Design a protein around this ligand. Structure first.
Ligand code: MG
Ligand code: MG
Length: 273
């Protein structure tokens, strides 16, 4: 079955294969030759498909993976949550993409998404991940990452095709440190958990806003960017309230309340983790 798929034979012309196992809610890639965790950028942590299939058996893994590199011709298009229970496409944007990008297509391991593998290059003005309102999403990659390989061919599309992908711009959002201070607040116990029922969410907002004022140097714009990636973000944040929004009033009250400020001369703080 899987060894008879033309796309698999094309991919098997590369020693960029891994195996993966499901751990928690994510799929971890493994070196198929020693069973250790595999880096997506170390070529000697991978194997050819013979080694990957033997390691899949040897270590009891859940499936094969393939690591994309800038040098190989492959592009990975991931259609998240686009299939119904009968493995039929339920998102109109996804139905359109498949009409316009015809190449190797397989059902993803969870059974409700699709993988499309194309020979080409991505447009430079599209974002790696686009999320839609119905919970579906579009992810595109051509390097620095592995894809799971299921061999569950969709609509008989078993062959990788050479295709220009500029028209991916119809579907992906167009594009034109914060993560540092995030990581800083996280490792110092200052990053909030998602609210549980019974919590005064608005009070969680202010406590986190105060911590943001310190760690962000009262940079209101940074504070806002940072809050939107936190488990306390909700639609109320952008709610018009009096002269502005609930979020903007919260952040300004935080800036007025906190006295101390973290300056990267490594200073420390009023609020405890
Ligand atoms: Mg998927
Ligand atoms: Mg590539």
């Amino acid at each position: 079955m899987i060894m008879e798929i033309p796309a698999i034979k094309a991919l098997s012309r590369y020693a960029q294969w891994v195996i993966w196992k499901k751990a928690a809610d994510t799929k971890i890639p493994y070196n198929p030759n020693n069973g250790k965790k595999a880096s997506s950028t170390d070529p000697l942590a991978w194997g050819d498909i013979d080694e990957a299939q033997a390691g899949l058996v040897r270590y009891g893994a859940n499936g094969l993976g393939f690591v994309l590199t800038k040098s190989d011709p492959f592009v990975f298009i991931d259609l998240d949550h686009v299939l119904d229970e009968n493995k039929r496409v339920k998102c109109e944007w996804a139905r359109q993409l498949l009409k316009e990008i015809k190449s190797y297509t397989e059902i993803s391991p969870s059974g409700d998404g699709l993988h499309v593998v194309v020979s080409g290059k991505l447009p430079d003005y599209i974002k790696h991940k686009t999320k839609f309102d119905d919970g579906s999403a579009l992810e595109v990659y051509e390097s620095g990452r592995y894809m799971t390989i299921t061999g569950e061919v969709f609509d008989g599309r078993d062959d990788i095709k050479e295709l220009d992908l500029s028209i991916l711009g119809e579907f992906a959002e167009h594009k034109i440190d914060d993560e540092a201070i995030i990581d800083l607040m996280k490792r110092k116990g200052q990053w909030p958990d998602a609210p549980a029922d019974g919590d005064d969410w608005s009070s969680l907002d202010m406590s986190f806003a105060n911590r943001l004022a310190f760690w962000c140097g009262k940079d209101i714009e940074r504070m806002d960017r940072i809050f939107r990636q936190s488990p306390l973000m909700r639609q109320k944040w952008d709610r018009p309230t009096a002269g502005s929004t609930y979020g903007r009033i919260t952040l300004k009250k935080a800036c007025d309340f906190v006295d101390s400020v973290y300056d990267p001369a490594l200073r420390n703080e009023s609020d405890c983790p």
